């Protein structure tokens, strides 16, 4: 055991030099004369309301029009962004929900929280539970619909697992992300997904198998959120070190770190723009800082929330960005 423990260290040293060996130049160096992003003077084009308590989760839909949201009131509200009407209000068996998800088909909505079970609500029939999952050891942190039939989850047990409504049992669980996985995202090509945990590192996983292939790291704190580039080739992890950063698959290393001297609050949600030029990122300073993804320019500010912003999302159509804050409000920015 002692020899194996010492042997494990020397493998990473070569792997650490592998990033150095493949490194060519800093992305900043790569992008010096690239067109300036310009001042995006975005304003508020909608302001939804009706949530009793603070919002923790919000996720758009593939139909570009409906968006779901969850709060400590124990209710899920489905909103029509175009017309600011309320479609469904979903009571929950529990009252401590920490994540929500929307089916691309639109017939189901996932919700989970401190309860070990995240509910898969049936939306097409008001709304009832299609299936309540078997459960994990801790609390579900982020739920996403890989497809209408497969569900991927992140819990408080350093455990992620692909699910299945048909069998009602986790088909292929995933283990290895020490700490507490709190973030999860899916690739536009639905065969990969990564996660972020309190281990100050993120790991890349393959759905068809159950073993991770890559492990991006360097964060000075716990990762609270993550999202993928429009192509399946980049990342954006937002941790509590007040520094989002860009990652690359083939590079297997960070490209640029997004931080500003007056920015010490931290990050709660992160999302890209449709063109991949902008890195929309919320902050615990009750603000939403937009950044040039191609560059590192911290250009584009989006203020107007009274309390912390915790959830952020960009429509698949790319028209508008949505922010939900602890103020119990959720307003669409375009």
């Amino acid at each position: 055991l002692d020899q194996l423990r010492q042997e494990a260290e020397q493998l990473k040293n070569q792997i650490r030099d592998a990033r150095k060996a493949c490194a060519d130049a800093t992305l900043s160096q790569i992008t010096n004369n690239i067109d300036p992003v310009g001042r995006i003077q975005m304003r508020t084009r909608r302001t939804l309301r009706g949530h009793l308590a603070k919002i923790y989760a919000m996720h758009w839909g593939t139909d570009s029009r409906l968006l779901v949201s969850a709060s400590q009131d124990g209710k899920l509200i489905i909103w029509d962004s175009y017309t600011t009407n309320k479609v469904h209000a979903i009571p929950l068996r529990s009252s401590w929900v920490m994540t929500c998800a929307y089916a691309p088909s639109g017939n189901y909505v996932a919700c989970g929280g401190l309860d070990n079970i995240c509910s898969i609500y049936n939306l097409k029939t008001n709304v009832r539970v299609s299936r309540e999952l078997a459960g994990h050891t801790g609390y579900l942190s982020c739920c996403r619909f890989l497809d209408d039939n497969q569900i991927v989850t992140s819990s408080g047990d350093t455990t992620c697992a692909l699910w299945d409504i048909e069998t009602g049992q986790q088909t292929t669980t995933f283990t290895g992300h020490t700490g507490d996985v709190m973030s999860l995202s899916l690739a536009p090509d639905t065969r990969l997904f990564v996660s972020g945990a309190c281990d100050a590192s993120a790991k890349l996983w393959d759905v068809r198998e159950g073993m991770c292939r890559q492990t991006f790291t360097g964060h000075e704190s716990d990762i609270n959120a993550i999202c993928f580039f429009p192509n399946g080739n980049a990342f954006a992890t937002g941790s509590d070190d007040a520094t989002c950063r860009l990652f690359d698959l083939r590079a297997d290393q960070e490209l640029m770190t997004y931080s500003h001297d007056n920015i010490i609050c931290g990050i709660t949600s992160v999302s890209f723009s449709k063109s991949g030029r902008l890195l929309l990122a919320g902050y615990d300073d009750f603000n939403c800082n937009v950044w040039d993804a191609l560059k590192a320019d911290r250009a584009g500010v989006l203020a107007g929330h009274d309390n912390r912003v915790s959830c952020l999302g960009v429509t698949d159509d790319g028209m508008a960005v949505a922010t939900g804050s602890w103020d119990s409000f959720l307003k669409i920015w375009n």
Binding site: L1, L4, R5, E7, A8, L11, K12, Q14, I15, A18, C22, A23, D24, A25, L27, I30, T31, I34, V37, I40, M42, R45, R46, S81, Y82, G176, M211, C212, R213, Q214, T215, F229, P230, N231, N233, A234, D248, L249, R250, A251, D252, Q253, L255, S273, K274, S275, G276, R277, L278, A293, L294, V314, D317, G318, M319, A320, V321, I332, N334
Partner: protein, 55 residues
């Protein structure tokens, strides 16, 4: 936890041979995607009010 110890080295070995391309080549790839779809971004270039649902 020998198995676990076996797992880490095994995992390290799995990624020990990670295939990789030039970092600049991957970095330059991000430039092409950003440039190609810049004209079709409803959020970067200000949206024409004639079709914006939030205008």
């Amino acid at each position: 936890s020998i198995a676990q110890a076996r797992k880490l080295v095994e995992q390290l070995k799995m990624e020990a041979n990670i295939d990789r391309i030039k970092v600049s080549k991957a970095a330059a790839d991000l430039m092409a995607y950003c440039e190609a779809h810049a004209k079709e971004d409803p959020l970067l270039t200000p949206v024409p009010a004639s079709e914006n649902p939030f205008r």
